[PDB]
Amino acid sequence: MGVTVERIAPGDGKNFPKKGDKVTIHYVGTLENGDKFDSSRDRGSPFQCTIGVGQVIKGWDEGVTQLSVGEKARLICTHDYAYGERGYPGLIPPKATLNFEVELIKIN
Ligand SMILES: C=CC[C@@H]1/C=C(\C)C[C@H](C)C[C@H](OC)[C@H]2O[C@@](O)(C(=O)C(=O)N3CCCC[C@H]3C(=O)O[C@H](/C(C)=C/[C@@H]3CC[C@@H](O)[C@H](OC)C3)[C@H](C)[C@@H](O)CC1=O)[C@H](C)C[C@@H]2OC
């Protein structure tokens, strides 16, 4: 049903990213078969972006807002909350479900 949050280790229960917030977030991205396509942890570098304003995939906009600082989780994004029917040429096959193991490090 779109984006689903599989909770692994809990956040602080208080600080949740809101629309327009900057988040600092480690992620490991895998395709529906288990193969990694991207990883901020292999670059030793958490990613930073603005949540809820249309700049990341829908699964992150509707999914990262459900986490609190410190939390580990998996966002399971079906293709309509990711790269859709065409996919991402070279990287993401069409209609793919994507699986992001994420850790929310900080909100601003
Ligand atoms: C000049 C632009 C390059 C610029 C690249 C960076 C800043 C480096 C940054 C680590 C991205 C990665 O570079 C290693 C690499 O990350 C992926 O592997 C990936 O894990 C992914 O899915 N992520 C990254 C983590 C957040 C969720 C999602 C994303 O939303 O990413 C965003 C994304 C592509 C959203 C599109 C935007 C267009 C909409 O139409 C579409 O809507 C469906 C969704 C990224 C951050 C963009 O906002 C900014 C950029 O693209 C992509 C598979 C391909 C992407 O490289 C291109």
Author numbering: 1 to 108
What wording appears in the published article?
McFKBP12 shares 58% and 65% sequence identity with hFKBP12 and AfFKBP12, respectively. To correlate sequence variations with structure and identify potential differences between McFKBP12 and other FKBP12 proteins, we attempted to crystallize McFKBP12 in its apo form. All attempts failed to yield protein crystals, hinting at potentially high conformational flexibility of McFKBP12. However, crystals were obtained with the FK506-bound form (2.5 Å, P3221), suggesting rigidification of McFKBP12 by FK506 binding. McFKBP12 shares the same fold as hFKBP12 and AfFKBP12 (Cα-RMSD [root mean square deviation], ∼0.5 Å) with a 5-stranded β-sheet wrapping around an α-helix. The three main loops defining the FK506-binding cavity (40’s, 50’s, and 80’s loops) adopt the same conformation as observed in apo and FK506-bound forms of other FKBP12 proteins. When bound to McFKBP12, FK506 also adopts the same conformation as when bound to other mammalian and fungal FKBP12 proteins (FK506 RMSD, ∼0.3 Å). Six hydrogen bonds (H-bonds) between FK506 and McFKBP12 are observed: 2 involving the backbone of residues Gln55 and Ile57 and 4 to the side chains of residues Tyr27, Asp38, and Tyr83. Interestingly, in McFKBP12 residue 88 is a Tyr, potentially sterically hindering the ternary complex formation with A. fumigatus calcineurin. AfFKBP12 and McFKBP12 also interact tightly with FK506 (KD, 4.7 ± 0.6 and 3.0 ± 0.7 nM, respectively).
FKBP12 proteins are members of the FKBP PPIase (peptidyl-prolyl isomerase) superfamily and catalyze the cis-trans isomerization of proline imidic peptide bonds. The immunosuppressants first bind to their respective immunophilins, FKBP12 (12-kDa FK506 binding protein) and CypA (cyclophilin A), which subsequently bind to calcineurin in a groove between the CnA and CnB subunits. The immunophilin-immunosuppressant complexes inhibit calcineurin serine-threonine phosphatase activity, blocking the dephosphorylation of downstream targets, such as the human nuclear transcription factor NFAT (nuclear factor of activated T cells), involved in T-cell activation and interleukin-2 transcription, and the fungal transcription factor Crz1 (NFAT homolog), implicated in virulence, stress response, and thermotolerance. To this end, we characterized high-resolution structures of the Mucor circinelloides FKBP12 bound to FK506 and of the Aspergillus fumigatus, M. circinelloides, and human FKBP12 proteins bound to the FK506 analog APX879, which exhibits enhanced selectivity for fungal pathogens.
